[PDB]
Amino acid sequence: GLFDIVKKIAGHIVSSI
Amino acid sequence: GLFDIVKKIAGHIVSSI
Amino acid sequence: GLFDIVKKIAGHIVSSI
Amino acid sequence: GLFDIVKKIAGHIVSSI
Amino acid sequence: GLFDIVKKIAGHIVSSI
Amino acid sequence: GLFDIVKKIAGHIVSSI
Amino acid sequence: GLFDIVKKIAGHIVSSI
Amino acid sequence: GLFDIVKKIAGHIVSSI
Amino acid sequence: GLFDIVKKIAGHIVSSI
Amino acid sequence: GLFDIVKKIAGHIVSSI
Amino acid sequence: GLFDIVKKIAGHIVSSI
Amino acid sequence: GLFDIVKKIAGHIVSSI
Amino acid sequence: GLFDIVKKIAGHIVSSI
Amino acid sequence: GLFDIVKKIAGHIVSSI
Amino acid sequence: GLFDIVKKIAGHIVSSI
Amino acid sequence: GLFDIVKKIAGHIVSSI
Amino acid sequence: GLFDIVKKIAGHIVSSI
Amino acid sequence: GLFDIVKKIAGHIVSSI
């Protein structure tokens, strides 16, 4: 079992829940 | 089992739930 | 079992819950 | 549910942008 | 639920941006 | 639930930005 | 509406025996 | 609304026996 | 609303026996 | 305008929401 | 305007919300 | 405007919220 | 009774009972 | 009774009972 | 009774009962 | 890597969720 | 790596959540 | 690495959450 997760973001306004 | 997930985003406004 | 998680962000305003 | 990625949502949502 | 990534949400949400 | 990453949310949320 | 009866439910609801 | 009855529920609700 | 009855619940609620 | 509302429940075991 | 509201519940075991 | 509200519950065991 | 009412609403998203 | 009422509302998101 | 009322509201997000 | 899981339920009325 | 898990429930009325 | 877990419940009315 192995997970390799990459999440890259960029922006003037960044929102998330 | 192996996961290789890449998520790249860019924008003036970025929203997500 | 192994997890390799990388989360990189950049922005003028960054919000999260 | 083994070795699995799960994302769920349930309700009343409202998004403006 | 073994070796698993879980994200859940349940309710009344409101997002402005 | 073993070897697992869990994130949960439940309620009334309001986000302005 | 002036004279009203309002009743709302929103989310993950369970009723078990 | 002027004369009202309001009743709201929002979230993860459980009723078990 | 002027004459009102308001009743709200929001969160993780449990009722068990 | 009258509102005549009646709810009745009976049983050895009851779960209500 | 009258509101005549009645709720009745009876049982050996009860769970209510 | 009158509000005539009545709630009655009876049982060997009760859980209420 | 006598009811004289005026309502003006403006918005991207609107909900009215 | 006599009711004289005025309401003005403005916003990206609005909820009114 | 006699009711004379005025309401003015402005905002990105609004909730009114 | 070895795992042994046993889950066992017995009754007149049963609910698994 | 070795694991042993046992879960065992018995009754007239049962609820697992 | 070795683990032994035992969970055991018995009764007329049972709730596991």
Author numbering:
A (entry chain G), B (entry chain A), C (entry chain M), D (entry chain E), E (entry chain K), F (entry chain Q), ...: 1 to 17
Task: Quote the passages of the study that discuss this structure, keeping the authors' original sentences.
Supporting this hypothesis, we here determined the fibril structure of two AMPs from amphibians, uperin 3.5 and aurein 3.3, by cryogenic electron microscopy (cryo-EM), revealing amyloid cross-β fibrils of mated β-sheets at atomic resolution. Despite the dissimilarity in lateral fibril structure and the difference of extended versus kinked β-sheets, the 17-residue ffAMPs uperin 3.5 and aurein 3.3 are remarkably similar in their residue composition. Overall, compared to other amyloids, the sequence content of the two AMPs indicates a dominant apolar and positively charged nature, which fits the functional interactions with negatively charged bacterial membranes.
A recently developed computational screen aimed to identify fibril-forming AMPs (ffAMPs) additional to uperin 3.5 found fourteen new sequences, including aurein 3.3, another amphibian AMP secreted by Ranoidea raniformis (Southern bell frog). Wrapped around this inner cross are four more strands of mutually similar conformation, each having a sharp in-plane kink near the outward-facing His12 residue, which is enabled by Gly11 leaving a void into which Val14 can fold. The overall packing of the aurein 3.3 fibril is highly dense, with the SASA buried for a single layer (fibril cross-section of six lateral chains) covering 9802 Å2, which is 83% of the total area of this layer. In the outer chains C and D, the C-terminal part of the kinked β-sheet forms tightly mated β-sheet interactions with the C-terminal part of the inner chain F, overall showing a stable interface of three short β-sheets, resembling lateral association between β-sheets in the crystal structures of short amyloid segments. Such sharp kinks in the peptide backbone are the hallmark of Low-complexity Amyloid-like Reversible Kinked Segments (LARKS) within functional amyloids.
